[PDB]
């Protein structure tokens, strides 16, 4: 179909012009909520502390990449610290940094991992993955966090976004290197 | 007495993609209203259908008449997300996270030449195993194709179909794969008034029945 | 919704499991996609 | 056979703020009647709304005409629970246990001068980023303000509003915070009959729509 | 009430879980708060 | 309080043939349509009833008139899946995976001689404990038997019955077992026009009431 | 069906436990078996 592309109005076509059909599609796997609803490893704690910042997610992982594909987002959160450690503790967004959690929410370990559920605690209606605040581009606020955890020992930290909502899509780039080759190619799983 | 219970081996270990929730620990928090917030998106394919992204032809998003060569081929590339022309597209961006796909694709061509410069183009889908990939409009006319000429409407949209032995194809290419298992798409210029180039911006979007399955975090090096 | 599916249920109350949403006083992209032109500009023949 | 059960990792550890009860061990105890016991309270904010507490101005709860200075400013302080003037108030006392708040506040002014001593005052809410904080009634009149004079009623009550980009503000001040993110409240004396002081007792209480969220035990040093 | 929320329930009987209250023969501060004057003393203009 | 539970010893260990399912980990996968796919089978015995397979008589599927010997016995073998004649049959193939069976069997005989070559055959079921296994049609006629002659129809089908003290018999033979606990089946040639062989292809299939029980993986050496 | 038998049930949803089958728009061997001739060719006597 010819069209006046300048106006930017969407155009989506079948194969019917050429005599074709349309297959039945089931896009369950491209559902945003479903996609982000899994645990992603963000790394290890530091002095047995870790600020819960979704921007800590590895940017080439499925979750890190998708989260960054949106300008704004909202979600609740689940945490799981795996490692040999006794107890993970937590403080909400806006609390002063402490020397010891003592009395704030504390959860004891069970068979080497501590997993628990948290609520969105920011003071904003939604958070952003980018924020052009005083950083004049020429050709992230304190508040953007989900609290902080305190642990008894070093552990691997995993975050899981629950009830996720994304707004204003942003680019998602391929991360494999073509080298000089035209096609990309790798070894895919095959019977040995 | 009390309820007898059998604890099972192999069940219970930490899981990263499990269908259950963690135990709560901090209640009664009411969020700020996020009513009517704009730009919400629900499925990657809705944005993928509506927003075409730029193909890359050695550094530029456009195909062109070009210099020396009596070659009518503006572009001919493997129908593959891993092809270098597809490298900077949202479709290839997303595809790196799924193992398989099925469905149609839409290629869009926007003509950029001045009012008095006229041309006539053609695009064809070349199936796998085709031998000497056609280099001429004449030969390529034997494939599923579309011819169109310039005029009042600058843009033309083409539907790259889905043919394969199987219902789904892979987004990645196995190391031992000499030819494109999915064939190629060739874009030719039948004729042009003026040899001074007229740039055609090429773009790609998901077709109405396109689909991805099997999310994968292909992570690293 | 999401990637959670227990035919049975959830043991703890809603006010503890999740944060409660509020309102004052909607899928842009679905709508945008829905609105795309899928016809034919000009006249068709044969 | 018996019920197969999967014991999950990460679940079960001791928790200090969990939503479940411990197993009982000593039954059948009936308590003495505590029917009609007076002074019961249910929510800290009910007492916080009804009982204003004293601000501190360098050791005393009152603001005053004062000695030498043609300065009409009786007090100007950061709208912050951590400001030193708020130091001994029930509101700041409670606020140390919550991370965020939202809502209005009420400031009360009780005049203490003799019958023949007359004055006229004004209080304004200065928003953040305001530059040279106004030092004169004249300049301060450009802000949300209230002017009142002495007479039969000794007390005047003012409502400190809530403006911010966000729906909630923090009760604490981050180390790197040069100016008050919430602005200031300035109390000025427009005029006074007699330079011999007339003390104005200042007091603070929660507004009808004030609210605290996120309990925290900020404990220690 | 309080900070306990199990959609399901409690396994042991009430007489074991808690102490039983008794009566002979009421939120002062809520009432006190409710009673506060929130109007305007004097006449309003404009 | 919470639900008291008693964890039981002896319950819970990994099991390879247990009646429960494992916990899921990867949801929402919809398979390609496999509607109308041909050749589906549901029970091994349906294919076992419908498809007879070849017996082996020292390298060949047929029994024959033969050379020198005034011996009318074409074949006489133990009613046993482990007999060497049954060695390459689907029935014996399957039987190695079950401990017991019961039921009837069908033996089929297809005559292969030229039009002018005529013969007359007989097959009998010899019960256990029978003494000198009959070597002549005359003697064998005293057993459950069937006689048939050649003609327009090339094939004849016989039903090997089930007699035993027990309701089920074993598919395998114990080491200390001198005689066939299930008896034998003897195939005799009463007479033949021409001594130049006429080959009779022998085949075996499950009877309508045949049955296997107790699956076993008899694995290895 | 198969070798699974819990009088009670299954805890996780179907979309997680198994793959979902689809259709476009049947036991050959049972039918084949059913169709076998089980009579007598020719005439019977006595």
Tab-separated table of N, CA and C in Angstrom, chain B residues 118-218:
chain	number	residue	atom	x	y	z
B	118	UNK	N	11.828	10.911	-10.913
B	118	UNK	CA	10.930	9.760	-10.840
B	118	UNK	C	11.674	8.449	-10.947
B	119	UNK	N	11.140	7.418	-10.302
B	119	UNK	CA	11.747	6.083	-10.271
B	119	UNK	C	10.642	5.044	-10.159
B	120	UNK	N	11.039	3.788	-10.252
B	120	UNK	CA	10.124	2.673	-10.216
B	120	UNK	C	10.905	1.548	-9.533
B	121	UNK	N	10.334	0.991	-8.472
B	121	UNK	CA	11.002	-0.040	-7.687
B	121	UNK	C	10.246	-1.346	-7.594
B	122	UNK	N	10.912	-2.315	-6.989
B	122	UNK	CA	10.350	-3.634	-6.825
B	122	UNK	C	11.038	-4.357	-5.666
B	123	UNK	N	10.284	-5.157	-4.912
B	123	UNK	CA	10.849	-5.928	-3.798
B	123	UNK	C	10.276	-7.324	-3.885
B	124	UNK	N	11.121	-8.330	-3.674
B	124	UNK	CA	10.670	-9.711	-3.766
B	124	UNK	C	11.125	-10.558	-2.607
B	125	UNK	N	10.377	-11.616	-2.310
B	125	UNK	CA	10.777	-12.539	-1.257
B	125	UNK	C	11.296	-13.764	-1.991
B	126	UNK	N	12.586	-14.039	-1.798
B	126	UNK	CA	13.232	-15.181	-2.446
B	126	UNK	C	13.267	-16.357	-1.494
B	127	UNK	N	12.581	-17.446	-1.846
B	127	UNK	CA	12.574	-18.594	-0.950
B	127	UNK	C	13.901	-19.337	-0.877
B	128	UNK	N	14.111	-20.075	0.220
B	128	UNK	CA	15.330	-20.851	0.429
B	128	UNK	C	15.562	-21.828	-0.692
B	129	UNK	N	16.827	-22.125	-0.915
B	129	UNK	CA	17.183	-23.059	-1.949
B	129	UNK	C	17.068	-22.488	-3.336
B	130	UNK	N	16.641	-21.241	-3.461
B	130	UNK	CA	16.554	-20.693	-4.800
B	130	UNK	C	17.968	-20.644	-5.273
B	131	UNK	N	18.250	-21.068	-6.505
B	131	UNK	CA	19.638	-20.922	-6.821
B	131	UNK	C	20.194	-19.558	-7.112
B	132	UNK	N	20.878	-19.338	-8.265
B	132	UNK	CA	21.432	-17.983	-8.446
B	132	UNK	C	20.411	-16.966	-8.043
B	133	UNK	N	20.680	-16.325	-6.909
B	133	UNK	CA	19.755	-15.325	-6.443
B	133	UNK	C	19.642	-14.368	-7.605
B	134	UNK	N	18.409	-14.076	-8.010
B	134	UNK	CA	18.146	-13.168	-9.130
B	134	UNK	C	18.806	-11.818	-8.941
B	135	UNK	N	19.394	-11.292	-10.001
B	135	UNK	CA	20.008	-9.982	-9.881
B	135	UNK	C	19.265	-8.986	-10.734
B	136	UNK	N	18.286	-9.461	-11.478
B	136	UNK	CA	17.560	-8.559	-12.332
B	136	UNK	C	16.085	-8.599	-12.037
B	137	UNK	N	15.405	-7.465	-12.227
B	137	UNK	CA	13.967	-7.358	-11.998
B	137	UNK	C	13.281	-8.490	-12.761
B	138	UNK	N	13.707	-8.658	-14.001
B	138	UNK	CA	13.190	-9.680	-14.891
B	138	UNK	C	13.179	-11.069	-14.278
B	139	UNK	N	14.274	-11.452	-13.638
B	139	UNK	CA	14.370	-12.768	-13.022
B	139	UNK	C	13.633	-12.805	-11.719
B	140	UNK	N	13.780	-11.737	-10.946
B	140	UNK	CA	13.135	-11.627	-9.648
B	140	UNK	C	11.617	-11.576	-9.770
B	141	UNK	N	11.104	-11.241	-10.952
B	141	UNK	CA	9.665	-11.152	-11.141
B	141	UNK	C	9.005	-12.506	-10.989
B	142	UNK	N	9.812	-13.557	-10.960
B	142	UNK	CA	9.287	-14.912	-10.784
B	142	UNK	C	9.045	-15.303	-9.321
B	143	UNK	N	9.254	-14.361	-8.414
B	143	UNK	CA	9.030	-14.607	-6.997
B	143	UNK	C	7.866	-13.769	-6.540
B	144	UNK	N	7.453	-14.045	-5.319
B	144	UNK	CA	6.402	-13.277	-4.693
B	144	UNK	C	7.019	-11.866	-4.707
B	145	UNK	N	6.352	-10.922	-5.346
B	145	UNK	CA	6.915	-9.593	-5.418
B	145	UNK	C	5.872	-8.499	-5.562
B	146	UNK	N	6.364	-7.273	-5.449
B	146	UNK	CA	5.569	-6.067	-5.565
B	146	UNK	C	6.368	-4.989	-6.286
B	147	UNK	N	5.748	-4.357	-7.268
B	147	UNK	CA	6.397	-3.283	-8.011
B	147	UNK	C	5.591	-2.027	-7.713
B	148	UNK	N	6.257	-0.886	-7.591
B	148	UNK	CA	5.542	0.359	-7.341
B	148	UNK	C	6.351	1.503	-7.864
B	149	UNK	N	5.671	2.588	-8.194
B	149	UNK	CA	6.379	3.729	-8.684
B	149	UNK	C	6.153	4.960	-7.811
B	150	UNK	N	6.982	5.981	-8.002
B	150	UNK	CA	6.917	7.218	-7.239
B	150	UNK	C	5.720	8.056	-7.665
B	151	UNK	N	5.297	8.953	-6.791
B	151	UNK	CA	4.171	9.799	-7.114
B	151	UNK	C	3.794	10.583	-5.883
B	152	UNK	N	2.533	10.979	-5.801
B	152	UNK	CA	2.020	11.726	-4.668
B	152	UNK	C	2.327	11.051	-3.309
B	153	UNK	N	2.127	9.733	-3.190
B	153	UNK	CA	2.425	9.033	-1.932
B	153	UNK	C	3.902	8.608	-1.883
B	154	UNK	N	4.629	9.067	-0.875
B	154	UNK	CA	6.047	8.754	-0.753
B	154	UNK	C	6.366	7.368	-0.251
B	155	UNK	N	5.462	6.841	0.548
B	155	UNK	CA	5.680	5.573	1.194
B	155	UNK	C	4.948	4.368	0.629
B	156	UNK	N	5.618	3.221	0.645
B	156	UNK	CA	5.041	1.968	0.183
B	156	UNK	C	5.351	0.907	1.242
B	157	UNK	N	4.376	0.050	1.544
B	157	UNK	CA	4.566	-0.980	2.561
B	157	UNK	C	4.407	-2.364	1.967
B	158	UNK	N	5.346	-3.255	2.290
B	158	UNK	CA	5.394	-4.611	1.764
B	158	UNK	C	5.276	-5.672	2.866
B	159	UNK	N	4.643	-6.803	2.568
B	159	UNK	CA	4.501	-7.843	3.568
B	159	UNK	C	5.374	-9.038	3.277
B	160	UNK	N	6.340	-9.246	4.149
B	160	UNK	CA	7.250	-10.355	4.043
B	160	UNK	C	6.500	-11.482	4.727
B	161	UNK	N	6.161	-12.520	3.964
B	161	UNK	CA	5.425	-13.697	4.425
B	161	UNK	C	6.198	-14.698	5.235
B	162	UNK	N	5.475	-15.699	5.715
B	162	UNK	CA	6.100	-16.752	6.488
B	162	UNK	C	5.913	-18.101	5.779
B	163	UNK	N	7.004	-18.688	5.253
B	163	UNK	CA	6.960	-20.039	4.635
B	163	UNK	C	8.062	-20.807	5.236
B	164	UNK	N	7.751	-22.030	5.589
B	164	UNK	CA	8.765	-22.820	6.194
B	164	UNK	C	8.147	-24.174	6.285
B	165	UNK	N	8.956	-25.169	6.580
B	165	UNK	CA	8.398	-26.484	6.743
B	165	UNK	C	7.651	-26.486	8.113
B	166	UNK	N	8.255	-25.814	9.087
B	166	UNK	CA	7.695	-25.760	10.418
B	166	UNK	C	6.884	-24.515	10.711
B	167	UNK	N	6.080	-24.626	11.756
B	167	UNK	CA	5.210	-23.572	12.177
B	167	UNK	C	5.974	-22.425	12.797
B	168	UNK	N	7.149	-22.720	13.341
B	168	UNK	CA	7.995	-21.703	13.951
B	168	UNK	C	9.410	-21.779	13.404
B	169	UNK	N	10.084	-20.648	13.420
B	169	UNK	CA	11.440	-20.568	12.946
B	169	UNK	C	12.255	-20.037	14.112
B	170	UNK	N	13.577	-20.146	14.016
B	170	UNK	CA	14.450	-19.677	15.079
B	170	UNK	C	14.873	-18.238	14.832
B	171	UNK	N	15.011	-17.470	15.906
B	171	UNK	CA	15.463	-16.108	15.760
B	171	UNK	C	16.982	-16.099	15.527
B	172	UNK	N	17.712	-17.095	16.049
B	172	UNK	CA	19.176	-17.171	15.855
B	172	UNK	C	19.618	-18.130	14.747
B	173	UNK	N	20.863	-17.957	14.291
B	173	UNK	CA	21.430	-18.822	13.242
B	173	UNK	C	22.513	-19.728	13.806
B	174	UNK	N	22.346	-21.031	13.598
B	174	UNK	CA	23.281	-22.022	14.093
B	174	UNK	C	24.587	-21.781	13.375
B	175	UNK	N	25.692	-22.135	14.021
B	175	UNK	CA	27.009	-21.969	13.427
B	175	UNK	C	27.087	-22.663	12.063
B	176	UNK	N	26.708	-23.944	11.997
B	176	UNK	CA	26.773	-24.621	10.702
B	176	UNK	C	25.512	-24.308	9.910
B	177	UNK	N	25.477	-23.163	9.263
B	177	UNK	CA	24.303	-22.788	8.492
B	177	UNK	C	24.893	-21.980	7.387
B	178	UNK	N	25.015	-22.575	6.212
B	178	UNK	CA	25.609	-21.834	5.115
B	178	UNK	C	24.695	-20.837	4.425
B	179	UNK	N	23.474	-21.265	4.119
B	179	UNK	CA	22.514	-20.393	3.451
B	179	UNK	C	21.434	-19.981	4.444
B	180	UNK	N	20.654	-18.952	4.105
B	180	UNK	CA	19.580	-18.501	4.987
B	180	UNK	C	18.481	-19.549	4.928
B	181	UNK	N	18.172	-20.142	6.077
B	181	UNK	CA	17.133	-21.159	6.116
B	181	UNK	C	15.783	-20.560	5.798
B	182	UNK	N	15.663	-19.237	5.927
B	182	UNK	CA	14.412	-18.546	5.656
B	182	UNK	C	14.390	-17.758	4.364
B	183	UNK	N	15.442	-17.868	3.566
B	183	UNK	CA	15.454	-17.151	2.305
B	183	UNK	C	15.891	-15.710	2.438
B	184	UNK	N	15.642	-14.919	1.396
B	184	UNK	CA	16.062	-13.523	1.362
B	184	UNK	C	15.005	-12.581	0.847
B	185	UNK	N	15.262	-11.294	1.048
B	185	UNK	CA	14.392	-10.265	0.502
B	185	UNK	C	15.324	-9.388	-0.341
B	186	UNK	N	14.934	-9.178	-1.595
B	186	UNK	CA	15.704	-8.379	-2.518
B	186	UNK	C	14.923	-7.149	-2.906
B	187	UNK	N	15.609	-6.022	-2.897
B	187	UNK	CA	15.019	-4.742	-3.234
B	187	UNK	C	15.769	-4.264	-4.465
B	188	UNK	N	15.044	-4.039	-5.548
B	188	UNK	CA	15.634	-3.624	-6.801
B	188	UNK	C	15.079	-2.326	-7.328
B	189	UNK	N	15.871	-1.654	-8.153
B	189	UNK	CA	15.424	-0.434	-8.769
B	189	UNK	C	15.312	-0.758	-10.230
B	190	UNK	N	14.094	-0.732	-10.747
B	190	UNK	CA	13.843	-1.029	-12.144
B	190	UNK	C	14.311	0.112	-13.005
B	191	UNK	N	14.068	1.332	-12.561
B	191	UNK	CA	14.490	2.473	-13.338
B	191	UNK	C	14.409	3.793	-12.565
B	192	UNK	N	15.201	4.776	-12.991
B	192	UNK	CA	15.286	6.080	-12.325
B	192	UNK	C	15.582	7.152	-13.369
B	193	UNK	N	14.882	8.272	-13.258
B	193	UNK	CA	15.008	9.435	-14.122
B	193	UNK	C	16.082	10.193	-13.365
B	194	UNK	N	17.249	10.477	-13.942
B	194	UNK	CA	18.360	11.135	-13.158
B	194	UNK	C	19.223	10.087	-12.432
B	195	UNK	N	20.536	10.137	-12.616
B	195	UNK	CA	21.376	9.178	-11.931
B	195	UNK	C	21.850	9.703	-10.611
B	196	UNK	N	21.521	10.959	-10.361
B	196	UNK	CA	21.843	11.564	-9.091
B	196	UNK	C	20.795	10.905	-8.207
B	197	UNK	N	21.332	10.171	-7.264
B	197	UNK	CA	20.593	9.453	-6.249
B	197	UNK	C	19.255	10.066	-5.771
B	198	UNK	N	18.363	9.201	-5.300
B	198	UNK	CA	17.083	9.607	-4.738
B	198	UNK	C	17.053	8.633	-3.568
B	199	UNK	N	17.186	9.103	-2.335
B	199	UNK	CA	17.228	8.145	-1.238
B	199	UNK	C	15.903	7.550	-0.778
B	200	UNK	N	15.890	6.233	-0.624
B	200	UNK	CA	14.720	5.519	-0.159
B	200	UNK	C	14.989	5.024	1.266
B	201	UNK	N	14.292	5.603	2.243
B	201	UNK	CA	14.456	5.196	3.639
B	201	UNK	C	13.718	3.886	3.852
B	202	UNK	N	14.431	2.893	4.371
B	202	UNK	CA	13.852	1.581	4.622
B	202	UNK	C	13.613	1.356	6.094
B	203	UNK	N	12.466	0.772	6.380
B	203	UNK	CA	12.068	0.584	7.752
B	203	UNK	C	11.352	-0.743	8.003
B	204	UNK	N	11.391	-1.249	9.224
B	204	UNK	CA	10.744	-2.547	9.481
B	204	UNK	C	9.869	-2.600	10.737
B	205	UNK	N	8.705	-3.258	10.621
B	205	UNK	CA	7.772	-3.417	11.752
B	205	UNK	C	7.115	-4.804	11.763
B	206	UNK	N	6.592	-5.225	12.910
B	206	UNK	CA	5.923	-6.522	13.031
B	206	UNK	C	4.605	-6.534	12.268
B	207	UNK	N	4.323	-7.668	11.650
B	207	UNK	CA	3.091	-7.799	10.915
B	207	UNK	C	2.009	-8.073	11.923
B	208	UNK	N	0.753	-8.005	11.504
B	208	UNK	CA	-0.400	-8.244	12.380
B	208	UNK	C	-0.502	-9.623	13.007
B	209	UNK	N	0.184	-10.609	12.439
B	209	UNK	CA	0.147	-11.972	12.962
B	209	UNK	C	1.544	-12.476	13.405
B	210	UNK	N	2.448	-11.531	13.625
B	210	UNK	CA	3.769	-11.889	14.074
B	210	UNK	C	3.699	-12.358	15.536
B	211	UNK	N	4.617	-13.231	15.930
B	211	UNK	CA	4.619	-13.743	17.292
B	211	UNK	C	5.982	-14.279	17.726
B	212	UNK	N	6.311	-14.066	19.000
B	212	UNK	CA	7.551	-14.555	19.609
B	212	UNK	C	7.185	-15.556	20.722
B	213	UNK	N	8.013	-16.585	20.896
B	213	UNK	CA	7.851	-17.537	21.996
B	213	UNK	C	9.212	-17.910	22.528
B	214	UNK	N	9.191	-18.377	23.771
B	214	UNK	CA	10.353	-18.821	24.514
B	214	UNK	C	11.306	-17.704	24.914
B	215	UNK	N	10.965	-16.981	25.993
B	215	UNK	CA	11.836	-15.897	26.456
B	215	UNK	C	13.170	-16.524	26.896
B	216	UNK	N	14.276	-15.853	26.599
B	216	UNK	CA	15.598	-16.326	27.012
B	216	UNK	C	16.434	-15.104	27.334
B	217	UNK	N	17.296	-15.260	28.341
B	217	UNK	CA	18.229	-14.219	28.753
B	217	UNK	C	19.507	-14.858	28.213
B	218	UNK	N	19.922	-14.425	27.024
B	218	UNK	CA	21.082	-14.896	26.288
B	218	UNK	C	22.373	-14.355	26.806
